[PDB]
Amino acid sequence: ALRLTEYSRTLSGMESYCVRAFADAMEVIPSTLAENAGLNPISTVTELRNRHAQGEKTAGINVRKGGISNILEELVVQPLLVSVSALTLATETVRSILKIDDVVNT
Amino acid sequence: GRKVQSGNINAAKTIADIIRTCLGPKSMMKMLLDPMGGIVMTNDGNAILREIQVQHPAAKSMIEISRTQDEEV
Amino acid sequence: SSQGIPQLVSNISACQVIAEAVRTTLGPRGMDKLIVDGRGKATISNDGATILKLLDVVHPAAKTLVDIAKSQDAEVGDGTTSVTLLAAEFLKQVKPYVEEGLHPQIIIRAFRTATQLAVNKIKEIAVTVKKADKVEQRKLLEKCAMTALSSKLISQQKAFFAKMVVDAVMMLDDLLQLKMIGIKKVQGGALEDSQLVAGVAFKKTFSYAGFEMQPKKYHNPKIALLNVELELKAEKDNAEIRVHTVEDYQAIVDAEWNILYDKLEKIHHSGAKVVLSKLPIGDVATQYFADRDMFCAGRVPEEDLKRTMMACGGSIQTSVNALSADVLGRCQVFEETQIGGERYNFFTGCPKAKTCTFILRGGAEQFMEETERSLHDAIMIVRRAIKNDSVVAGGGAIEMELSKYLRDYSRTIPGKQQLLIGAYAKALEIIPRQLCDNAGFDATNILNKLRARHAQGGTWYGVDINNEDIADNFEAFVWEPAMVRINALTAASEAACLIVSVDETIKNP
């Protein structure tokens, strides 16, 4: 969300504003992971954004606790393919959904 | 003093008020109005209890414990 | 909702309704209120007492609540909203208990006992941090004030307001004073130029002449005050009888202005130099003063008028004549100077010493329209630091100390009163809770931090108003005086017990 907001800032056309909206949309999942932890979502998501805007490019919410502790060790890790597949499939689905004007019956 | 004990007491009072007049040598007659159209006469309380309708569960339990009483003696 | 429990529930609900209109106002950086009622006119204020005065409390419980709350007068600190909210939250925390059939008098006893123990605890733990002999107390008064306004940008001007507030400490040395706290709004220029002047200062001057033609270094001017207009005679007066005396059309007002000239000669040989009035004065009169070694300072609001009359020890006149007496005082020096974009007036010293003021530049509205409330409160802070012996950590720190002490002492009491004392101690938590909520960052987390930081270690921890997390409010000099907080807590307890102890409200039509 941070880097892609920067990219949308560098981008032109309505596509730039839409890519910024892409980043603002994607920041829901860390927010809702916080909202399923004890931490309030807004402070957690802004703290994570500040951390990633100050180096420390891997920080998030773990399972062993609720606070922001993902520097090392207790950090939860996944192969990127799951995340990039989530992005690709969700983007194709939203492409299809907005690609629709009407649903017709045969 | 919750409402359930009040309902228990009210059902007991209704059934006892029905039965009271059946006590003593000078006991009253009672009217049994079977919705088929006939009438059953009775002098004593056991006969009216054996067929009185008690839709309230408190009065129904009162009838069951009356059955428990009358089966013994 | 007739007698006993239902009526008490209705009364405490009305107390909650009137509290929610003031609970948001609590705090130094309080989220303020807008009141439309009274003539259909808007007003904005961040004071609980103000919003309670302008709002009308129709309901009896709210009526007596606000009466007893404002009876503490909250002149020193923002105590009206604190008392109101403590009372209301006592009622809130005892609502389920009185609802479940708890007799409303043992609860009165519980409140009285808990309040007595809380007062004893505060007086036992309040620190008498005021050494009388050492004069350099300024080096902590300045810190206390600058931390009371630590939220705004303070690069170096913090020292200027610090010197202002401490020299105003020795300037309001004698007694509790009310004019002293107002600061004159100035527009334009940088914020560097901020200096003390004694007496009073006056608002925007009109385009009247004599700005410097009559030198503005009036030495020992006798002061004049006015309540009757001197006006132009542009309106026509009819005199049509014959055309032989065309000058008679104006002789009727020539007589009136000759009478006024006699009055002005009376003022002139009475020694009065500068004339103050509530109402605009005609231009011709302004030039009469300019020629005749005297000056016009009219159309000024009455607050400056009472300020100046108690500066001079005199009284109002309600007349233009009969001014040849000691009805007014004698200031040492009058000066009028072009400061920034507007010409202002000064009376340094005056005859008595309970009158002074300060000049505030900065060329903006934000920080100084804030000032009219914030530095109001901040020099009030320093006045509590000077004139109240003992202080206790504010910002709910003492509220958490009570929420721990009274709660454990409750769990010590054997009788059924102990649960009610525990509810009392829980109700004390609203002040840090609401103060934190009005600061925006979530109240629950800060309250948990305060809970865990008490019961072990230092007690002075409370909410750090400037930051999000917790801090020693005592160390940051964010104090509340011991005696004033005793009075506020006792008033809140009395309000709570007086609300709880009343049955049906009866009225005869």
Partner: protein, 516 residues
């Protein structure tokens, strides 16, 4: 109203089961169907029978039943504690506390509470009960005191349970309550009662032509019954023989001379035999000395088999006596006395081997009060047995739920995270057990819970008063009592699991968000 719809259903179930939590609780009329009126005051039965209609109540009752199937009977404690936890958790959520923070709070609170109970609130049976079981039985008697009696019955039951101590594997010597040979007796001075080591039978009186009037070395058991008649197994009449139809019994009687020789070789001089054996058949063994005792019944048979190891079917399989008798069904003991006591010639098998059972003669004037004291003493035996189960016990009467409330309240402020407010709210929630036990008494809950909690705080803050750890409400009264020097006890395992399952229920039903 997506989570409160679950919390309120659980709270309604708690309100229904609440009025019957303690031994003094009220009766519940439960009718799962029309006309099937049931009146029970034990909340476990109504929970098994109450037809919940809401899935939250479904799952909470399912966890309660799982707890019942696992250990003990604390189902009521589970339900009320869990639902009060739910009500207070929903109050926390209304205060904008996030649900999973409350989840972590209750989880850590349960863990720390279990640790506290295990480390400084359990009292061990190997330390307890040398005299305190007497007063515990007294407290059990307090439910059905029928006069000045009760103190002598307490000594009676304590001496019995010491004597009937069932030495067994795992070092957990508790006895089965039904094993004891309790006996009602009329025409007796009811305020005495004698205890005699060894089990007792429905002894024959008024027909003992058999000379059982003299002490015996060993007893032999027999669940067969030789008979002239087809009332029991082994006797048949289908045989086509005018002689064999009759002398099958005579041949069996002559063969049983071998069996009585076997019992004599094992050590027995009297053999007991179930109902249906002929008295003239008893004469055959009376003449040979190894006399036979009639009228022992199925309960007598099971008591004999389980106590003395007298497994009649261990080697004897057919009704014929030609099979091998040995010690496998002998009434192993030291001696057997048949003294005439209180006009009754009871047969007492002293020092029964492999289980040292005892006999209780419940002296009483009338049938009804004899049955009543039998019920009350059975309850006392069960409560002391339940104390002895876990080998470690905690003070009943809500002392634990109160003491633990103060420790959880103190330990909430020990930690700074958002979970600590849930810790505190759980601490105050757990007092619902003392609150309910007080409501079930005529004394108001507020005052008695206040006194209880103040006593427990005194135990927590004034370390000299460590004996104050275990004052709780009297179950059958409305005052706080020292629940070790006197009073009730409940096993630590059952109540610690009660708290654990209550917390797990309060998590499983609170993590719910919506039904879709």
């Amino acid at each position: 109203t997506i989570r409160s719809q679950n919390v309120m259903a659980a709270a309604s179930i708690a309100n229904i089961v609440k009025s019957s939590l303690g031994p003094v609780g009220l009766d519940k009329m439960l009718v799962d169907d029309i006309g099937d009126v049931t009146i029970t005051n034990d909340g476990a039965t109504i929970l098994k029978l109450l037809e919940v209609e809401h899935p939250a109540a479904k799952v909470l009752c399912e966890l309660a039943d799982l707890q019942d199937k696992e250990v003990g009977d604390g189902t009521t404690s589970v339900v009320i504690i869990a639902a009060e936890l739910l009500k207070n958790a929903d109050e926390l959520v209304k205060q904008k506390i996030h649900p999973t923070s409350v989840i972590s709070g209750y989880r850590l609170a349960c863990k720390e509470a279990v640790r506290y109970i295990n480390e400084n609130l359990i009292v061990n049976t190997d330390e307890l009960g040398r005299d305190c079981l007497i007063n515990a039985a007294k407290t059990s008697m307090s439910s059905k005191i029928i006069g000045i009696n009760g103190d002598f019955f307490a000594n009676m039951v304590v001496d019995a349970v010491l004597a009937i101590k069932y030495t067994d594997i795992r070092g957990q010597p508790r006895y089965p309550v039904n094993s004891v040979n309790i006996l009602k007796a009329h025409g007796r001075s009811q305020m005495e009662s004698m205890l005699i080591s060894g089990y007792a039978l429905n002894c024959v009186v008024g027909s003992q032509g058999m000379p059982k009037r003299i002490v015996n070395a060993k007893i032999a058991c027999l669940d067969f019954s030789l008979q002239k008649t087809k009332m029991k197994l082994g006797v048949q009449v289908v045989i086509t023989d005018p002689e064999k139809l009759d002398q099958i019994r005579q041949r069996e009687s002559d063969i049983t001379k071998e069996r009585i020789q076997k019992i004599l070789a094992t050590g027995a001089n009297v053999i007991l035999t179930t109902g249906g054996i002929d008295d003239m058949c008893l004469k055959y063994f009376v003449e040979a000395g190894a006399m036979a005792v009639r009228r022992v019944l199925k309960r007598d048979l099971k008591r004999i088999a389980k106590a003395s190891g007298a497994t009649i079917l261990s080697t004897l399989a057919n009704l014929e006596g030609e099979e091998t008798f040995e010690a496998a069904m002998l009434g192993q003991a030291e001696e057997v006395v048949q003294e005439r006591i209180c006009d009754d010639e009871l047969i007492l098998i002293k020092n029964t081997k492999a289980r040292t059972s005892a006999s209780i003669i419940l002296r009483g004037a009338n049938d009804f009060m004899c049955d009543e004291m039998e019920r009350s003493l059975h309850d006392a035996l069960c409560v002391v047995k339940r104390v002895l189960e876990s080998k470690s016990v905690v003070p009943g009467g809500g002392a634990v739920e109160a003491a633990l409330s103060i420790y959880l309240e103190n330990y909430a402020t020990s930690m700074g995270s958002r979970e600590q407010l849930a810790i505190a709210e759980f601490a105050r929630s757990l007092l619902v057990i003392p609150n309910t036990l007080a409501v079930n008494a005529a004394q108001d809950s507020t005052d008695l819970v206040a006194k209880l909690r103040a006593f427990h705080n005194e135990a927590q803050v004034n370390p000299e008063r460590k004996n104050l750890k275990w004052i709780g409400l009297d179950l059958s009264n409305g005052k706080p009592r020292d629940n070790k020097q006197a009073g009730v006890f409940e096993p630590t395992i059952v109540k610690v699991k009660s708290l654990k399952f209550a917390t797990e229920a309060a998590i499983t039903i609170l993590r719910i968000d919506d039904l879709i």
